Amino acid sequence: SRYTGPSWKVSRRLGISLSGTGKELARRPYKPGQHGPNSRGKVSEYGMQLTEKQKLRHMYGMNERQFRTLFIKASKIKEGKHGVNFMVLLEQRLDNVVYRLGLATTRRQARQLVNHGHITVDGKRVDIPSYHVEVGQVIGVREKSQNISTIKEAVEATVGRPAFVSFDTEKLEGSFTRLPERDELYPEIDEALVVEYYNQK
Amino acid sequence: LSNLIEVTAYIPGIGHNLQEHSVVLLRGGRVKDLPGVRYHIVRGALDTAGVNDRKQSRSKYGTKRPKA
Amino acid sequence: AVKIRLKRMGSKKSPFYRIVVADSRSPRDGRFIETVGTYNPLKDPAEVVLKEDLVLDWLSKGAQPSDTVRNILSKEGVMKKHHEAKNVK
Amino acid sequence: PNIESAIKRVRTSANANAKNSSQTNAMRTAIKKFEEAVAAGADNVDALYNEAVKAVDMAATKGLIHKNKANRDKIRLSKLAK
RNA sequence: UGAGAGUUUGAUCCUGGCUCAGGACGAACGCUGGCGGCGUGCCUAAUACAUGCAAGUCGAACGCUUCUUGGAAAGAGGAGUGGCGGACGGGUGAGUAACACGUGGGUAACCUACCCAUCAGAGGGGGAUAACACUUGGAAACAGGUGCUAAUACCGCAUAACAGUUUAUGCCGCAUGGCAUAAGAGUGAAAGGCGCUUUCGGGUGUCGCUGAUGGAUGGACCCGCGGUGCAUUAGCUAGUUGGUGAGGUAACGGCUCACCAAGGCCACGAUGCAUAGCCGACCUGAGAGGGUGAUCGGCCACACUGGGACUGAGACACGGCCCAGACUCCUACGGGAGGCAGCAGUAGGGAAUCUUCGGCAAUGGACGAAAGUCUGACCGAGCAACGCCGCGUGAGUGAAGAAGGUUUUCGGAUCGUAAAACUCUGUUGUUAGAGAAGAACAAGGACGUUAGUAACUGAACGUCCCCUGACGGUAUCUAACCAGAAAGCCACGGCUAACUACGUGCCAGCAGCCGCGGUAAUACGUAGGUGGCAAGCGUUGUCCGGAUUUAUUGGGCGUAAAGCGAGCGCAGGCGGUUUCUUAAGUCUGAUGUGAAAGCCCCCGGCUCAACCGGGGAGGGUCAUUGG
């Protein structure tokens, strides 16, 4: 499964945008349902760690088993911290590479582009979105049929291109220069609440 | 029971169809109503039948999904 | 009846083989004496690795190859060396 | 029996048993015939010692006693007469 | 790499139990389900078993017989004598508390078919028998009698002692003794087949045959140490413990005998009773630990229940023999036949566990000189969300919030950018084209080299032609078409994330622990909404954690549970100061070993991942030798 629901209730429940600052929390910044505008008392310190974890899980649209295995894998580095290495491994998945490069507006669109077989790493096609893109691998746009309507238009309007992403808008090749850093990556949510959430799992 | 030791067992839900000499299935679970009862029968698993109003936790009580 | 034979180590339809010296009564994947090289039927020019200093020692003690082991031991030039050590002295 | 080859082994081994027992009894009586004449103190005492030795030796080439049993036997008899 | 919470009271602190929040599984069952990849699937009655298959092969060891092409040579069948195989491979865990297993050693007490090497032989004779032909008794299974015949079948005679044993010599070892050399005494084997040269040539290639010695491989025996409950189980032994001799075995030995003696084992747990195959490993834990021994590998034990031997290099024998017993079956009543804990399958037991499938193409195994024949091992296919992993059931833009549902103080709020509408996409689906790797070979032809030869045939490997796929038209790749076929289960009073209506009225019902329900129930039952997970989601059972709640790590005994009513003392546990010595504990170095697969570290291949491969570390309370 992935998810198909209204995708905007989700942001109103975390209190974070999740869609490139394009405002879902413009009107009614409160939660969904009857008891939306009428908030109530405090939230535990279990609700806080759960809310941080859900923020990160819904950012990149993955499921709970895969999230937890990625977290367990990031723990075997021991070079740096354990939340930084996590949120950095999270960025190296082929879906974020298409999002950051700029071939798609959303992450759902980028996911459908990499699922339906329209992109290639090093020339060879790769079809599965949880792929692990390493540093220095020019991912391309299937030079067979790169004349599609939405890819073309979403290359023009560059809302955000980062300081670790390289790209050329003629051959349509991009790559990571090097690994990013927390200052360059959502210094807003957390990586410590999420680490504590998995201590008693 | 098949091993020939005797026990009493609670039958849950609203309304059943159990009569003398009908064959049933037991699971663990102790009721806190009176002594001497330590088991539950499971609804909709043999001669016993699922309850016929439920709409909310039909996986217990053994109710099938209704088109309503 | 010591032998030099192949031993299957793939998954289901991607086989791999270890070259092994075993007593002939043993099961194909059961007990053996020691391992002597490797062999890969895929990988279009098939891959052989082997020590070839234990093959020449077992051969001179009466071990005997199977039919495929003899083919891949002559493609490596091990049977010629046995020839030049035994019937030459 | 069920298998065809198991039916042949039955008669083959029956025949082997027959002749094996015949020849073992031959050897045993040769030895005993020497012993009963060394226990009497009789003339013609080295010839039947020779014959008993030969009997044991021939039984060992017919696959009836192992080979160490034959060494043991010849030793025992040697210590009795010669 | 060591997280806690609720619950004794009118309120408190301490003690204390009970319960919950994490994992995992050969799982079962309730509701519900789209696919691929890799794995897994009688835990119960070691219950009883219809039907098919699971072990044969050799005509280049030997005589016969039937055909297809009266004397003809080949091809294809049939039984028989003889060799080798049937002790492997495959199944199960009933017995077993012991050298059964693990780890470390010993055998100067040992055996070993096929395979590799070395030395020496391979001479000359004899008497039979199955088959076949005729014949008797048989319900049958099957038994007898007469006559002829072959061999690599069988038996004696020769020749061989390098084997064993005894004597002298030399060297040596941990008692018994070991090695090498010399003699002396009695003794023991053997078989041919197919080719080449064939002047009688009498020579020779190859595969077999006999004796002796090594290697390899497989087995046998003995020893140190280690892993379970009960003392509401303290005595156990009479071939028992030792000696002398005799027999016996591959082999040492009370292994078994006759005699002689009175010994052996036990509080450091003998004996008995109950339970159990053992290990690599697997789950959990911060660790020390605790709980399991299913898939895969190693060792053991058993084969309808209980005794025995025979053949053989090897069995006291898994689809062998003989006897007894229970059970089942056929019979002319005199008698006969059988053993799924091999693969499928059936009835029964159970909460519960699969097809009476294809093929020897690949790897291994038996026989054969080889083509080959056999192989339910094995390689593939079928069934099942049983598990792990991967990808879907669309994507983008879209408002004053369309209709409807729920609520409302009747203004509105929420389901909700969610639908609509516009533009896109084709992983999947469908239809149509193309389309694999897994295969290396044996055999058969030509050609070369080396060691043997009088010489050639052949031997042993090199180079080249030629020859084979069950899965299967499978994976995969290309073209067109369509958002169309593909979301459910649990919870929402506190623990613990997520609230309002209506119905009912200590009823109907709910609960893991606190506890809810008697007119305005966020705790029962529905609806709207919300939370957690998702092709799954909950429930019951079992184990480790939380539990310092058996505390070595790591607790206590004035009043909470807990100092024997007091002394005297055998065994045990622990002991003042100091000089020299020893090296049992302790510390340390080097060498051997602790299989493979697993966990872990680095690297690499399947579009990724599960999964697969290569190189390492780790794991001993271990042994030997030096400080």
TrEMBL record, chain A:
Pfam families associated with the record: Ribosomal_S4, S4
Keyword Protein biosynthesis among UniProt keywords: no
Entries under CDD domains matching the protein: S4
Chain ranges of the Small ribosomal subunit protein uS4 N-terminal domain: 2-91
Listed GO biological process terms: ribosomal small subunit biogenesis; translation
Domain of life: Bacteria
GO CC terms, sorted: small ribosomal subunit
GO MF term set: rRNA binding; structural constituent of ribosome
Domain RNA-binding S4 residues, every copy: 92-156
Sequence segments annotated as region (Disordered): 21-44
Keywords assigned: Ribonucleoprotein, Ribosomal protein, RNA-binding, rRNA-binding
Keyword Ribosomal protein found: yes
HAMAP family documented for this protein: Ribosomal_uS4_B
Purpose: With S5 and S12 plays an important role in translational accuracy.
Assembly description: Part of the 30S ribosomal subunit. Contacts protein S5. The interaction surface between S4 and S5 is involved in control of translational fidelity.
Similarity section: Belongs to the universal ribosomal protein uS4 family.
The protein's name: Small ribosomal subunit protein uS4
Organism of origin: Enterococcus faecalis
Automatic annotation (TrEMBL), chain B:
Organism from which the protein derives: Enterococcus faecalis (Streptococcus faecalis)
Functional description taken from the UniProt entry: With S4 and S5 plays an important role in translational accuracy.
Residues of the full protein shown: 70 to 137 of 137
Domain of life per record: Bacteria
Protein's recorded name: Small ribosomal subunit protein uS12
Description of how the protein assembles with itself and partners: Part of the 30S ribosomal subunit. Contacts proteins S8 and S17. May interact with IF1 in the 30S initiation complex.
Homology family: Belongs to the universal ribosomal protein uS12 family.
Coiled-coil ranges per UniProt: none
TrEMBL record, chain C:
Keyword Cytoplasm part of the UniProt annotation: no
GO MF annotation: an example: structural constituent of ribosome
Domain of life assignment: Bacteria
InterPro entries per record: Ribosomal_bS16, Ribosomal_bS16_dom_sf
UniProt keyword terms in alphabetical order: Ribonucleoprotein, Ribosomal protein
GO cellular component, one term: cytoplasm
One of the protein's GO biological processes: translation
Keyword Ribonucleoprotein: yes
Pfam short name (any one): Ribosomal_S16
PANTHER family: 30S RIBOSOMAL PROTEIN S16, SMALL RIBOSOMAL SUBUNIT PROTEIN BS16M
Family under the similarity heading: Belongs to the bacterial ribosomal protein bS16 family.
Name of the featured protein: Small ribosomal subunit protein bS16
Native organism taxonomy: Bacteria, Bacillati, Bacillota, Bacilli, Lactobacillales
Gene that produces this protein: rpsP
UniProtKB/TrEMBL annotation, chain D:
GO cellular component, one term: cytosol
Keywords assigned by UniProt, alphabetized: Ribonucleoprotein, Ribosomal protein, RNA-binding, rRNA-binding
Listed GO MF terms: small ribosomal subunit rRNA binding; structural constituent of ribosome
Sections of the chain in a coiled coil: none
Biological process, per Gene Ontology: translation
Transmembrane segment boundaries: none
InterPro entries tied to this protein: Ribosomal_bS20, Ribosomal_bS20_sf
Family according to the record: Belongs to the bacterial ribosomal protein bS20 family.
Protein task: Binds directly to 16S ribosomal RNA.
Protein known as: Small ribosomal subunit protein bS20
